Each structure stands twice: as structure tokens, then as C-alpha cells.
Amino acid sequence: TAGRVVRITGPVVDVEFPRGSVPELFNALHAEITFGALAKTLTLEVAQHLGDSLVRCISMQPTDGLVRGVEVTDTGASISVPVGDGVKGHVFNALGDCLDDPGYGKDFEHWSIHRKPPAFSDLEPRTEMLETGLKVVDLLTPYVRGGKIALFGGAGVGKTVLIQEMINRIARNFGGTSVFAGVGERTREGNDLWVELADANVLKDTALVFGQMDEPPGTRMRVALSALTMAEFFRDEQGQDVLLFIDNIFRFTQAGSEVSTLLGRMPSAVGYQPTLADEMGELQERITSTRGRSITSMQAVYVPADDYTDPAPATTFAHLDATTELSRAVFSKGIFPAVDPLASSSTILDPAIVGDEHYRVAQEVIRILQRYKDLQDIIAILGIDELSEEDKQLVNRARRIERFLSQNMMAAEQFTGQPGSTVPLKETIEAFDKLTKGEFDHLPEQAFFLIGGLDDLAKKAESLGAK
Amino acid sequence: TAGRVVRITGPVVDVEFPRGSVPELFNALHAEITFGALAKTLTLEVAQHLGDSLVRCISMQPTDGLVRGVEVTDTGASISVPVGDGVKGHVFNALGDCLDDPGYGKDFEHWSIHRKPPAFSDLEPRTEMLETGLKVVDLLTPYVRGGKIALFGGAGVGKTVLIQEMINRIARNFGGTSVFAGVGERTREGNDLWVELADANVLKDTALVFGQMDEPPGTRMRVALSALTMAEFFRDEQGQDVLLFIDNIFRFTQAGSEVSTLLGRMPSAVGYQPTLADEMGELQERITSTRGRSITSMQAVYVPADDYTDPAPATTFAHLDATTELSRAVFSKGIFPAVDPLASSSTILDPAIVGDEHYRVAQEVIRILQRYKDLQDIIAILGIDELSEEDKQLVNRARRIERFLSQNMMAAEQFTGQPGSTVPLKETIEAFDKLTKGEFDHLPEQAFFLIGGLDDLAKKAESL
Amino acid sequence: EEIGTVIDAGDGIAHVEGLPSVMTQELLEFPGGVLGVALNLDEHSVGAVILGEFEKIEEGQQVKRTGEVLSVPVGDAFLGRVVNPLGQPIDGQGDIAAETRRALELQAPSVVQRQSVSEPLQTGIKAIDAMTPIGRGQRQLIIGDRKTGKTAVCVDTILNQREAWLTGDPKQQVRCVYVAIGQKGTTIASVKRALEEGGAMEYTTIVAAPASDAAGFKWLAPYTGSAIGQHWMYNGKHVLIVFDDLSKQADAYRAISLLLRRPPGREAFPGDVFYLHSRLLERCAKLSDELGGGSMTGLPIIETKANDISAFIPTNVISITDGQCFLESDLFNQGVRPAINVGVSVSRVGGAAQIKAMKEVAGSLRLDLSQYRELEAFAAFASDLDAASKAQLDRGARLVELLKQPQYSPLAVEEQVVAIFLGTQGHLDSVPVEDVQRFESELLEHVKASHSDIFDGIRETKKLSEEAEEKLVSVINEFKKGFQASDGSSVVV
Amino acid sequence: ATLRELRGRIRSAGSIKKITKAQELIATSRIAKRGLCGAYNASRRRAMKSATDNADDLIKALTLAANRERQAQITQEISEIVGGANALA
Ligand SMILES: Nc1ncnc2c1ncn2[C@@H]1O[C@H](COP(=O)(O)OP(=O)(O)OP(=O)(O)O)[C@@H](O)[C@H]1O
Ligand SMILES: Nc1ncnc2c1ncn2[C@@H]1O[C@H](COP(=O)(O)OP(=O)(O)O)[C@@H](O)[C@H]1O
Ligand SMILES: Nc1ncnc2c1ncn2[C@@H]1O[C@H](COP(=O)(O)OP(=O)(O)O)[C@@H](O)[C@H]1O
Ligand SMILES: [Mg+2]
Ligand SMILES: [Mg+2]
16 A cells, blocks of 8 residues: 655655555655665655645655655654653754654654644733843844744844844743754754753753754755644643744745745745745744743744845744844944844834833934934935034934944854843833933944943943043 | 637636637627626637637636536627717726616617727828817917827826816817726726716716726726727717727726736736737727827826836837826916926927927927926025026016916816816917016916916906 | 545645536535635636645545535624634634625625715824825725834724714714734734724624635635625625735735646736735725615725835735825834825825815815925024025924824824814914924813813814814913923913 | 845935035025035035036936836746746646
């Protein structure tokens, strides 16, 4: 009652089955590569029923060495991953195989990686602020405990460094479980994260699921589902708060688009699969907090070619409670974290939750920065002196504010050699309120660059000679 | 000899016929949807011959409830619309069915909407000017008889009142009729236009043809041809000078693009249909003056992204002779019609056609108005007194000229009890020649609002 | 009885051989209680879109035809309930008593079956109510980039309908329908919570198509909402339908069409996407008195990218609708909130959708704002500016500060009239800009506290009478005497 | 990326245009009654009028380029979409 391979084109395999033995959609099939140098067991996910008892499947492993007409065994179920507290402190691939200890977890309970999202009735909005200690994030992009957080940005703007910073600032003191999903990222980054978590003794509370960018598209598409399944087990069965880090979520979409044409789908705009939004919605709606069960999800979102209008990030935007868009311009100015304060948002940045003072200070900062952005070109061409006295004062205030929004992060010590700093929310609000009132116009703008709070500001000012 | 549906993919339907009963291209076939909720009679237009006695057709109505294999009757002719004096004062769709009275016009003569343009010999080689009687239109942007006029105007600018005025003027002065073609017409706006024309009594002088936005692309593409066929009958078989309004022509282009995409043709540049220029020429070339009778057209044109190099407006403007732009600024100042003299234009404003004196006076008026518009910013910011004495007198003269380009339109008799006026071209030319010479500076600005000829100017002067 | 066989299935589509008598758009029953819609019909098979649980579809399964095109239950029981595009509750509050059923593709009212839009639909937002008025039966687009306050505007309108609902007169009540397409489920929960806090769920129905739903549900949700609203509209009631947002519906329909191998056009959209939206939005009409006089007002939302209003779907929807409210993030960051761009936003219905008092007070607002936009560049040189233009710039600044509005705080029409009266009659000229807003609010409170007769006159007569105007000016002067500025100075004279 | 850069340059040129026009009008007022003078050191009203006209020309050129790029992007996107569809045909 087993099938056989009929067609092979890269990561897509056609398999023919006897009548009545056609596997169900998403079932995991096993095929054997017997070549000496590449012997292995391909896991194939049934993607389409082609008719005539043929099924099109995506290979999780490379198909090099595969031979037409070889035995294909139907497991009768979707790809499953181990679940339970035993996963904590170990590294797994998209298929649930343990990397740091091969064969580990084979006896645990196994959950199918394909699941439905929680019922609309169970869903309940979350509005508690999550204090991080970064000035820009705390002020302009407050994070939600149990909510969905994203770090948008092009390549090399600071998404991964910010993810590590949030792991340091949130996961270290977390009282619950953490799940990290490295979706189609660099293997070196995975090893670095593993070693870092081991050093900080936080690995024992963290479960790592890695699918790297050198793996076939199938692994990159299903690794996020595997990690989300582990997180869902922790949320629903253990009933404990869960931290879920995903980096990079866009890799899921990219892998989905890689096999789209090979699956017979006609391309949508920007060469994306027609089911871009549908797959994104399924995956993102599985990532959520239910009534009484909290998942704090932080996702790094790659923006292709710094183009925020790209269909992938544009579709992703709708699934987030708080967004921090990292900008290439801010990055190139030397401001770190390279957050674009004008493009960032938070569903809880209104007076009802964060309070009147926080909202007022944030809105004044945003207004000053917007006006400075407007005057950027006039300054560039005609020079500052041609602005009005009020405009010049606003420009100086905005330069100092944008420098002050920068900070020395703990995860950035290896890049600047400067130890990181943390700023309490109240100090941040007070300092930015003072800045928007011109209380620090006398200090040089360089005094506001890559510092912590007001004490660090005074120290740097006196180092430069100001007071 | 009746066909049967084989494929149904949205508004595209494949129909099979016996070997020797395959309909000709553009023939109108009839199918039936019998489902109670959506019961209706689908009109299909043969678009392609697929071979093996299969024809691909575009449905003029939504295909919901259509079943495969249902009988499809062939009428033996393309879409035919009623013609004659009876269609005046009524509303029809692209298929000729009367909307204000179903069944009306079924006994009228029916003309196929697909017709060739006038033969080469029939075309009049001499471009002729159409005297609308409006001072601004006649002077600055003379309309071409049998020509095409682009219309531009925002909300609340008097566009509909201008259309109404043109309807009344063509009905009275030239003893003609009007045909309105709502391509992509909004049902709300169509009802509004119907009610307004009925209220103003000009509905009797016009025939309305609405292809609405809720209809599939085929009707939105063929409604313009339907209205043009009615106008062609009026011009040819009845010897009338017809006036054909089209709103919006870009929506005709967009419907053509949608139909092309539905039929599977590869899009051309910017995603338009490969035969964009051919379709636009086929529609526009039928709007011409022939045998002493003309169809003059005023077409509302939408420019995507305000990019006049876009293929749709670029192709449309190849067939346009005049251009009238209505401005909120001129409307605010109370000038009616709210035509922008500086922005508007006309291809026939050259001495070879309008004569030396006409061109000279028009250019002098345009120069004065442009100079005043240049002054406008200084006047607004620094104040009027800042201007030199020569600038002051030029500002006053230009303001008087701008007011005198206004006029009490005939269609405005409803909104104000004042009846409209018809200013002969010679009178307008001499009056504006006098104005540019300063012969009316002593008179107050008030004397130049909404009047006709020089006699009206004088009368209103003593009135003040 | 006709039974078809599933011959293939992939990512939401299933081809079914058989059912020779199946209709286009007919609903089909796949095993396990799965539902599909027959969209592609040809001699070989029937390509149907699965409405949910596509993974349960297998080759060789038996498919039955329902004999009926897509239809949804409709009735008064849907008020305050959250349902999916099939009319089934998803809020876990039991069954819904359906008065009847409506096909989702019933034709819209014809040209002869409508009447001109003549009744205001007060959104409670001063900017919209004064600059781009919306009448009942009108289709007003809300178009802008993400996080510009479009959902805020729609929710404020729905909340504002509460007093009209409480009046109890069916000629004043407005039944609200909110359609959520491709939205995060918790976002729909937040919207429902906001409506509930304002007592709006008593007259509001939510058609929810969360992002996790099949493309079929995202494609059908606006039509389900439209049918639910139509059932009330044809029975003499007045309806307000919000689509949040049509761009996601267009994307879902494009996905469906591409998976069905239909020829793509610009931006890969099929040839009838404009037809999709026009068919959806032409059902929002103002019925003639012969048909009960009911109406349905459409408030579609469009999310542009990089403020590109010349894109395909934005262009189509802008062409379809009777007016547009353009929301810009630059204004939003400047503090202008709601961030409606009054320069480009337009309502083709115009003054016909305003009461007499609102039309009178708001007549000068357009001119003042345009002139202020012209004079913006000279704010640095007030001395150079002449007296007229200087006072004109100041008046424009006060007016721009006036149109600002806090979220979830709709204003009654009389309150809006009084506020715009303050703005356009020089009663804010003696107030600092930063205080204008505060002043406004306080003054309104004062008028409610002791001088409600002004509001009563405006509401019942729709006109600000001469004696009412004099009393309002007197109250304004007294309040100015009693008013305290933020800078500590005085505002009298 | 070129379209976004062109749009940014268009808005920059527009802001330059408004600021230069305001300077021109203020200079006119002052005449009736810093280095932005045209060539006085090598008048400010003349220089600002020239700058505003140059900004107008630059804006028109940038708008033409942006419209060309918009049309090209639409055409190329449709080319890729139809190429994929034909490949799958
Ligand atoms: N008038 C207002 N004053 C202040 N804040 C407002 C106002 N309107 C909306 N906001 C805030 O602006 C942010 C965006 O608003 P909203 O989500 O309603 O807009 P949107 O453009 O529909 O958003 P999205 O991209 O989520 O669809 C939210 O924080 C909302 O609270
Ligand atoms: N806080 C910071 N201080 C200094 N440099 C930083 C900081 N954050 C990020 N960077 C720089 O940004 C680059 C990209 O970092 P990373 O986040 O790993 O890539 P991506 O942003 O693509 O995920 C690094 O080379 C690093 O030098
Ligand atoms: N000659 C005129 N006298 C007075 N009012 C006019 C005149 N022409 C146009 N208007 C005004 O212009 C407005 C718009 O008119 P119309 O063109 O009919 O509708 P639309 O605004 O849809 O174009 C009307 O309210 C009308 O009062
Ligand atoms: Mg990274
Ligand atoms: Mg929204």
C-alpha cells in the first residue's frame, strides 16, 4: 500500500499511490536515499492531491541522490514534534530531532505541527505594558505583555541584536518557559545564541528550534510551525506564561514563495505565492494569547530591500500589537537601536493605559521629530540659518532628542566595546519631557549619543566639558 | 440550431453550436438562468471562435445561477439598440432595454451598435467652429463642430449645469438633440441626473444611456457604442446636429482592458489591452461631421495618477480637439460658467480658422488674465496697495475682463429667475476688443457679472 | 440525486467531476461538513473554493450539491452578534433566530428605485461632518496608510449612532454592520470591546473574517454584511455598513482567482476585481419612498502603501465611491487627529447631506482652511504679512486646532455646530492656539450645564436662530470672562 | 527603490519651492519698505524668483521621471506575472 516517486524537481516530489492508499493532505511520507555519500531518509509533506492517485509533496531534506520509483511509506499523520517540559533546554530541528543530544525526546508526547487557531470566543485583547528598559521602545513603542511584538527592518539594521537584547532584558527574569524559533537564519547565529543562553543559565528554561537558511524550503516553512506547536503545548497544557521569539518570520513566507511555482500556482504580485496572506494569517493567528493563557511573541520581520510596501511585511503588519520599524537611514546615521520613531506604533500607547504624562511626552517627541524631518531638506539646501528662530530651536531640540533615543545596549557590547545600560520608564519620561521643553539645549548634541539616563547624560556632558 | 453552454468562468462563457450554426463575431446570444432568486436572461456577445464549433462570449450580466448545457439562442445580429425620436426622454442600458419603462422601445427600429465610421470621401475636409453662444467658450476655446471636447471639473463646480446648458443650447440654437452616455455611471449619480433633467424640462431633448458600475465589463464597454449609435441615427437618418456627452471615457478604456484580461490576452504597456488605440479610434472616429450634419462630443476624461503620458489619456487626447477645465477657484468667485480661461485650450484657436481679429483679441485677453494671475500672489500676501499704478490699473482691467467672461446661462434660469443669453461671436469679439482697450474701466466690477452682450452690459451699468 | 467526485485538491481549491446540473456559485457539501462554492465550470470538472477545513478534502470524496446559491440568514436577531460570512455565530452565545434568508448576489436597486441623498449621517467627527459630509445612502471611502485612524473614524461613527438609536424612532435609528476582513482576531475583539463600552453593540452586527479564515470567507464577508444590511434597508430601516477593509477582500479574491488559473492582469488581479468592488458597493443605496424609504450607507476602508492612491484597488474604489476621506500619517504625526486631509478629501453629495445650521456655519471653513494652507509658508514673517493676511493665518491656525478630536468621543450635531460657530465667528481669535481645544470642550460643557436650550433649538429646528445666536454669543463672552488660559493670560476681548 | 528616491526628491524640491517663493515675497515687501542674494557679493527677490522657477523645472522633470518609472514598474510586474502564468500554461 506504499507509493513510489514519479517526478523530482528540486524540493518538490511527485508520488504515485495505489487506489485507496492516497495519503491525506499534510501527511508525512518517508523515502530512502541509498547513495553512500548522501544516504538518508527524506520526509515529504503531502502538499497537493494531483489526481490519478498522485500527490505533490515538499521535501524537508535535500533531494540530491533520490531515484525515481523508490519506495515511499505513508506515516498516516502530519509531521509531529515532541512536547513537554523535557524539550526545555535542548535544540531541535523542524522535525523534532534533537541536535545537542540525538535520539532525545523520541519517547515524549508528540503533537502534530498543523493546528487550528484558538476560537474567536477564547481570544481576549491584552493591554498590559511590558517594560524593557530601552528609552525608544519604552517611550514610543511600548510593548504588551501577552501581546504580539514585531521588529521590522531591512537586512543588517539590528533586528537580531535587538532580539538578543530583549532576551537579556525579558527572558532572563522570566518566570515561565521560553521558546526560540530560528526560522531560516544563519547557523552561526544559532550557535552563538545557544552558547549565550548556556552561559546565562537561561537555556534550562528555553527550548530552541532551528531551521537554517541552507535547508530546503520545506524545513524553513515548517520549523516555525514546530516551534509554535511547542509554545502552544506550553500555553494550553502546562498553563504557564510563554516567551516566543521568532527570527526571521519572513523566511517562512520566502520559503512558501520558493515552492509556489513548482507546486503549479501562478505567481502573485512581486513574485509572491497567491496564498501569501492565507498562510501568514494561519501562522500568525496560531501565535496569540487566549483568555487566562499568555504568550508574549516577539518576531523579527525582514523587509525586502528596505521596502516597507512589499507585500510580505505589509501583510504581516496587520498581525501585530506593537511594531518597531528599524530604518536604514537611522542605522546609517549611527543611531542605535536604529528605530524609526515616526513609523513605530503600539496599540497601548494611548492615555488610557500608559497614562496622560507618558502619552503627552511621546506625542510631543513625535511631533518634534516630524517637524525636523520636514525641515531636513530645507536645512540641507538653504542651510539652518534661513529657518525661523522657532524652527532653529526645534531643529536643535530634535537633533538632541534623536541622539537621546539612541542607547548602548547590552547585546551590542561586542560591537562598540561599551557596556550596556538600562533606563527605568519614569526616568525616560522625565528626561524626554525635559528635552521637549528645551532644558538641555545648552549641552552639545554629542553628549546625548549612546548613553543611558540623565546621570549618564551629565557624565558625558562634563566629559565633553559642558554642564 | 441552438447552442449549449460548455464552460462558465465568471463573465466569460463558452458555447458550443452545431457544425453549420456557429454565430458570427459580436453576435448577441441569449441564455436563461432559471433559479428563482437570480432568474434572468443572459445576453452573451461572441468574442472569439475557439474552433470545434466552440465560441467564447462575454456575458453582459452576472452568470450566477447559470448551468452547463442550457440552451443558447443566437439572435443572428450583434447588440442592437432602439433608434428614432422615441428614445428621447428615456433611459436605456447598453443592451437597449428601457430602464424607466421596461418594454419601451421594443417596437422601434433597432440598429446594430457596431458600425463603420463615415467613408473617406464622406468626411468633411474643412474644420468648422461650433457657436455655443457662451462668451468664454466661443472666445478662448472655440468648440469644433463634429469635434471632441475634454471636460475637467471637481465636485460642486457646475459641471452638470454646464452639460445642461449645452443640452439646451444645442436643442434650441442648432435644432439638434443630445445623447448622454454614462460609462461606469454611478446609479446614485444616474438617478440624480435623470431627476435634474426631468425637472429642467431638457430631458425631452436628450436620450440617456447608462452602463452602470455594478454591471460586468462588457456592458460598460458597449454602452458608449450604444449611445454613439443612437447619435449616429439622429445625425444620419434625421438630419440633426447631435451632441454626445460621454462620462467617463477612461472608464470605457478600463472596461476594455478588463474584457481583454478576461479573454486572456497578454496586457500591453502599463497593463492596458493590446488594442487600446484601435478601440479608442473605433469609438472616436465615428464622432465626425458628415453631409452637413455633425456629432459634437463632450467627454469627461480621467487622467490616472495625473499622468498625461499614461497610455489611456495619451490615446484619448489624440482624438480631442478642445479642452474645458472647470475650477473651484472660478466657481467661488461667482463666475458662471466656472471655466478656467488660462487652463482651458482649443486646437482651432489659430487665424487660419477663427480669423485674425478673433485670435488677436483672445490672445490679448489671455495675456491680461495670465499677468493678473501672476500678480495674484503678491496681491494676496503683500496687499493690493503695494502694486504700482500700472499694476493697479491692469488688475482692475483684468478683474473686469474675468467678470465679463461670466454669463447668465440658460440652464441657470431654474436656480435664478434671470433667463439666459446668447452672445453672437462678432459681438463677443468686439466687446472683448473694447475691454482690452480699457473702454469700460470707469464701470464698476458689479456691472460685469452674468450678462450677455454689450447691450446687457450697458443696461446693468445704468441699473447701478 | 447527483454526486460528484473530488479529482484533485490543493491550497483551498478542489476540482469535482460530475454534478452536470450544478449552478455557478452554487454551494456544495463535501464530507465532514465541509462547504465549497462552485466557481469554475467546464466540460471536465467543477473548480470549487473550500470555505474552511480544506485539509479534510481528499481525492475520491463524494460531493453533494445543495441546489442553492450562497445565501445567509437575515433578521433583527443579528444585532449585537458576531457571525462569520455564513451567518453562523462565532461569539459562543448560541443560535440566532433568522427571520429569513437572502442570496448574496441579489441585484442592487435600479436607477428608478432610488432617491437623492438628503438625510445627514452624523459621524460625530467635526472634520468629516463639516468638510466632507456623509448622507444616508452614500458610499464614502476612508482611504489611508496603516495606523492613520481609519478604524478609529468608523468606530466613532458607529458609536455616534447611539443617541439616534435611543430615540426609538425607526426613521432616525441607524443599524450598524461592521465587516472585518483579514484582521487579527484579537483586533476584532478589541473593536467589539470598544463598541460595547459605548453601548453600540445594542444596534451593531459584526461580520468577522479573521486572518486565519479561508480565502473564501475573506472574499464573501463583505457580501454577507451587505445582505444583512439589505434585509433592513428594504424594510424601511437605515443602515451603516463599514468594510475594514476592501483591500484584503481584493487580495483574497485575487488568491482565489489565481488558484483557479484565471488570467491575471495588473498586479495579478483578475479582470473582474473592479466588478467585485462595484457590485459590492452599489448595493448601498437610498431607496425611494415606494420601497419604504430605507437606506444603507457604505464606509469602505482602503489601506494604501506609501500613500499611493494611484494603485489599482485604491483607484477602482475611489472611482466607485461618492467621496473620499484621505488620512495621512504626516498629519497624524503633526498632531492633526483625525488626520483627514481636508485639501484633497471630497464629498460629492456635499451640503445636501448637512443640516441647515451645519451648512451655514461650515460655509466659510473651506475657504479659511485653503487660505491657511496657502499662507503656511509665511508664519515666520508675521510682521511682513499685512493685517488681513496675518489675522487670516491666525484664524486658520485656530481652525486647524479646532477640528482636532480625541478618540472614542463623537460629538452631537448641535455640539459640532456650536464648536464650528466658535471657530468661524472670531470667538477663538482671543484664545491661545494650545488652549483652543480645551476651551472648546469646556465651553460645550458649560452650554450643557446651564444653557441646553441652544442645543435643543439647534437639534429640533436644525437652524441656529438669530436669538439663539445672540444667547450663544453672550454665553461665550461670559465663559471667556470665566475662562483660564494655560499661559495664565486672559482671553476676553 | 528608484521610484521612492524620485518621490523623496520631488517632495524635497516642492519644499524648496515654497520656501523660495516665501523668501521672494518677503524680499519684495522689504524692497517696498545672509547670502541668499543672487550675485550681490560676486537682488534677493530676483534670486528667489530664479530659485523658485528652477525648483518648478526640477519638480516637473522629477515628476516626469517618476511617472516613467511607475509605468515601467507596472509593465515589468505584469511581464513577470504573465511569464510565470505562461510557464505554468
Ligand atoms: N483621533 C485620534 N486621536 C488620537 N489617537 C488616535 C485617533 N484616532 C486613532 N488614534 C490612534 O491611532 C492608532 C491607529 O488607529 P487605528 O488603528 O484606528 O487606525 P488604522 O489606520 O485603521 O490602523 P491599522 O493599520 O491597525 O488598520 C491607534 O493607536 C489609535 O488609538
Ligand atoms: N546597538 C548597536 N550598537 C552598535 N551596532 C549595532 C547595534 N545593533 C546592531 N548593530 C549593527 O547592526 C548590524 C546588524 O545586526 P543584526 O541585528 O545581527 O542583523 P539584522 O539587523 O539583519 O538582524 C551588526 O553588524 C551590528 O554591528
Ligand atoms: N449659473 C449658476 N448660478 C447659480 N448657481 C450655479 C450656477 N451654475 C452652477 N451653480 C451651482 O453649482 C453647484 C453644482 O452644480 P452641478 O454642476 O449641477 O452639480 P455638480 O456639483 O455635481 O457638478 C450647484 O449647487 C449650483 O447651485
Ligand atoms: Mg538577523
Ligand atoms: Mg484599521
